[PDB]
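The protein record filed here.
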Amino acid sequence: PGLFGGFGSGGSGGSGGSGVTPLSLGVETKGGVMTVLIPRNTTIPTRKCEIFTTAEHNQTAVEIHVLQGERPMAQDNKSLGRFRLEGIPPMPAGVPQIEVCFDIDANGILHVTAKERSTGREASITIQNTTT
């Protein structure tokens, strides 16, 4: 899926450790679908960049919901967090597409970012509770 969902649920659970991640890391896409970007059993640094194009109504900012799991529906995966990329034109009719990158460290640290193509503005979150 090449679009955005954005369920309000952040996480508020948290954890901590290192080694390998028990669940694969991905984003939520419209219709409640979970799109995996990073495979699990993470022991080495791993980068993924994916470009998502979508037409949203009255959009002032794009909110990326980050989860871990293997389930085809994001509803059934563990929500790690979310971040909202702001500075998007208020109602961008003709919006190009927002680039989301999942960067993984050797310690298995999940660093997610999103950058709007036309505006060039970016926002990033570092989730350090992915690994065991």
